[PDB]
Design a protein around this ligand. Sequence first.
Ligand SMILES: Cc1ccc(S(=O)(=O)NC2=NC(=O)/C(=C/c3ccc(C)o3)S2)cc1
Length: 559
Amino acid sequence: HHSYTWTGALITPCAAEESKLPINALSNSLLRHHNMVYATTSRSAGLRQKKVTFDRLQVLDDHYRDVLKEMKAKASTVKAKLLSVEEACKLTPPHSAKSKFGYGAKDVRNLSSKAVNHIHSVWKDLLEDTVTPIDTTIMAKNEVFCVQRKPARLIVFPDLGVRVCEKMALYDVVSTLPQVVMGSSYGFQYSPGQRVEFLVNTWKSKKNPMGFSYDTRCFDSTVTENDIRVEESIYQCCDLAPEARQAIKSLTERLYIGGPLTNSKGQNCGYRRCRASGVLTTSCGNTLTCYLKASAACRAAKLQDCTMLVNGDDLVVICESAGVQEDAASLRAFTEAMTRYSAPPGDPPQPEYDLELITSCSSNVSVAHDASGKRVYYLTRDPTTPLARAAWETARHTPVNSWLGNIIMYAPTLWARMILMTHFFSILLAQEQLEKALDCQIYGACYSIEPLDLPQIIERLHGLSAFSLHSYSPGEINRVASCLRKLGVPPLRVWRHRARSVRARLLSQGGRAATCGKYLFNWAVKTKLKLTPIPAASQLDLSGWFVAGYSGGDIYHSL
Ligand SMILES: Cc1ccc(S(=O)(=O)NC2=NC(=O)/C(=C/c3ccc(C)o3)S2)cc1
């Protein structure tokens, strides 16, 4: 019952890899301690293979089955539709991994006969073959981090022709079923502010609030064949077309459960018997299995009024405290249960009685004040990784601009406004690329966004308060200040100074550019403006922005 088996072939790169932070003329103005930023590469794939390769054991008791039966009863009320080959295609990212059968993402999006005929041949093979394992490619992701060096993560994905077929049979399911089964516990249905809201209201629901985060040690590797089959049984509970049921069954047996691993060179690296990180059901699967295991664990551990918030493999639990002494005990029992369900923790979970001290989705709740001086809760996080990535994207263009994604998700934060906004807008101005659409990610899905619409976007997601927050918490202030010293990032006084400059320049521009300068940097000027609502704000269709998670799902939404 090992998560993986390796032949011995190395996981090879499909192009040149950079580990050292690239440096240009704009680098120093943002970060000076360059040697602290790095990117993971193949050179460490070997190290990761050892950490994710182990034997999984499972003991399923009555609590587990009782929770599963409840989840299935809700799943039965779901009606999912089959997507046409045309629809699935328009959901394919413009720069997704090209197929090894004579066509690419560009051909898919354009509905090229070659790509369409191949996708149809794959779909037919799926309905007729429910046993032959589907091939997958294993790659070492190139992610940027700040020292303390972690080994590169592994991404496993099937050929483009298959990815389009997954969408057709499962897109609607992974987009609607999660919220029906888990209700308010499904995290991907909330925007940053809504997540904070649900968290605060829940915490205030308990007489004596007690919460903790649960970090599983390499969740994907703990996912067993049983878990993947249970996932399929839940999908099958939905009202689906017979053709969709067949495809879902086939994808499960042939791909989701396991399959052979092939490096970029074409060599078999081994076999997978755990969760594939690069399939459409990765987010939904991880969320359903994590919610199922934790729900049962809360019953085994005897937690009281346990409310959960699940986002893929990330779990948050808020319940009624029974005393600092009991909490610690129950929590330990919870862990044991989870472990028995094949979900061992990497780091021992610790009970918290302070909301702001609980970190989930790499983020935490915090408080600041708006113009009126009213206390306002917002979602923030440790800026280390976001800044390290900003340094990299400062000297190197990337497929996904994290700085943009981060601004959108953390616009109300001190670090995002003060540094990310000031820095990147300064650059956009110098290159006159303000109206140039850029790609970023939100819950794993890829979105094309124009920097000039940021003000309207932020208003819709966070509210005008995002443009006037001040007097942050000491805890937040120190964490930001510390990170700045660590990386060697200029102080507030510097950014404020640069912001007035960028602001004055944006105003001069006029139109959307003036709007950006007025709302995004109003915090820099001594004489703050009124900052009223924005007209075109409600013109964008931010519908599918916060519905579900698609991490590794190769999903693209044309905004
Ligand atoms: C993006 C932004 C930047 C600055 C402001 S503010 O008007 O100077 N009010 C603040 N409140 C704090 O908690 C702050 C942290 C803080 C205090 C001292 C240092 C170095 O950082 S500043 C507002 C918004």
